Amino acid sequence: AGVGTVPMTDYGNDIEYYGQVTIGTPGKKFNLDFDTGSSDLWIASTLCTNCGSGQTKYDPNQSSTYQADGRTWSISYGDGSSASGILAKDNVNLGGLLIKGQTIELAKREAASFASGPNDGLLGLGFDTITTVRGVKTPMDNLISQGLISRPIFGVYLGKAKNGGGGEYIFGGYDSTKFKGSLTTVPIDNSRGWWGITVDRATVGTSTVASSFDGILDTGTTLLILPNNIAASVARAYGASDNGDGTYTISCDTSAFKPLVFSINGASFQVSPDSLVFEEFQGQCIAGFGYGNWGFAIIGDTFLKNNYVVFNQGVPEVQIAPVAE
Numbered sequence: 001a002g003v004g005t006v007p008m009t010d011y012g013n014d015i016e017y018y019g020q021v022t023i024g025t026p027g028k029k030f031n032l033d034f035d036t037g038s039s040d041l042w043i044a045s046t047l048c049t050n051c052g053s054g055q056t057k058y059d060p061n062q063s064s065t066y067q068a069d070g071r072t073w074s075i076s077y078g079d080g081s082s083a084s085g086i087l088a089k090d091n092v093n094l095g096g097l098l099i100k101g102q103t104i105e106l107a108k109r110e111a112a113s114f115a116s117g118p119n120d121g122l123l124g125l126g127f128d129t130i131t132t133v134r135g136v137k138t139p140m141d142n143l144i145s146q147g148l149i150s151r152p153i154f155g156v157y158l159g160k161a162k163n164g165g166g167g168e169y170i171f172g173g174y175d176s177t178k179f180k181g182s183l184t185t186v187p188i189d190n191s192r193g194w195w196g197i198t199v200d201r202a203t204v205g206t207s208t209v210a211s212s213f214d215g216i217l218d219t220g221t222t223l224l225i226l227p228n229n230i231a232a233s234v235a236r237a238y239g240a241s242d243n244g245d246g247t248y249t250i251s252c253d254t255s256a257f258k259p260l261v262f263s264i265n266g267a268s269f270q271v272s273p274d275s276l277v278f279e280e281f282q283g284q285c286i287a288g289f290g291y292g293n294w295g296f297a298i299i300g301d302t303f304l305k306n307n308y309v310v311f312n313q314g315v316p317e318v319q320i321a322p323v324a325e
C-alpha cells in the first residue's frame, strides 16, 4: 500500500474496523480499532491478567526499544468497557510511517468485552485534550511534529460488509476514487476533545424529522446515536419500535424506506436505506439508529460507511463527500 496507507478489516456487520500497526523493535503486528472518539493508544500486554487468549500481546522483553515509565493509566469508555495498566515508550509503525518514542499504554486489566473482541487494543484519533494522562502526545501529534505527514490530515473510507467490507485510512492524504463529486468543508468544534460538527437538519422524504443539532464524528461507535426526541422523531418516520434499551426494531425490508438525509453546511449526506438495518437476528432487525441520554448525537459507523471523511487536525475541520458506490 502507499505511504501512510492502512487497509482496514470490517468486523461482522459493520460493527467496527481495525487495522494492523507494528510496535517495537523488531516489532509485532497488532490489530487496533481506529477510534476518533478517544485519544489513548493502548494494547493488550504480557502484564495482563484477564486478557483474551486470542489477542496478540505486546511483550516489553522482546522490544529492544522499550522504555519503562512510572505512570499508570485507567480508562472507562461510555459503553461501560474499561482497561488499565502502565505507560511505556516505543516505536509505532503506521502504514510505513515510523513514529519514534510514542507513549503507549500497556493493559494489565481489560473488560471482558475487550477480551472477546477482535482487536488487540485501540488507536485514539481524537484531540490530545482528552488523553487520560496529561502530557501524552497522540500519534497524530507525533506524525505532525516528526514531519511524517506534510498536511495534518487523515482520509477515512469505511466499507460495507454487504459490498465486501474493507476500508482504508490514509495518513497525510486522501483518495478520490472512494467518493463522488466535490468534498464539502465543515468546521469542527474540538472544545470537548472530539470531532464535533453541527447538522443543519434531518429529513426523511418531505418530513423534517430534526432541526439543527450537534454531533461528534466517531469511528469507534457502531450506530448513529441520537438525543431522545430526535431519535423518536426518526423512528416515527420508519415505523420502528423502541426496544427500551437504546435500540429500535425495524422492518428487515428496507426496499420501501427513504434515506435519512442530513443537511450539513449546505450539502446533503445520507444514511442509505440498506444502512437503516444494522443486524438481523432470527428474523428481527435492529435499526442502524439508536438513542442515548445526551444532548448531542454520536455520528457512528452507520453514517461513516456512507460518507468519506477527510479529518484535518490542524484547522480543525473535516471535508465530507458521499461514498463512491
Ligand SMILES: [Ca+2]
Pocket (backbone or CB within 6 Å): 016, 220, 221, 222
Ligand atoms: Ca467502540
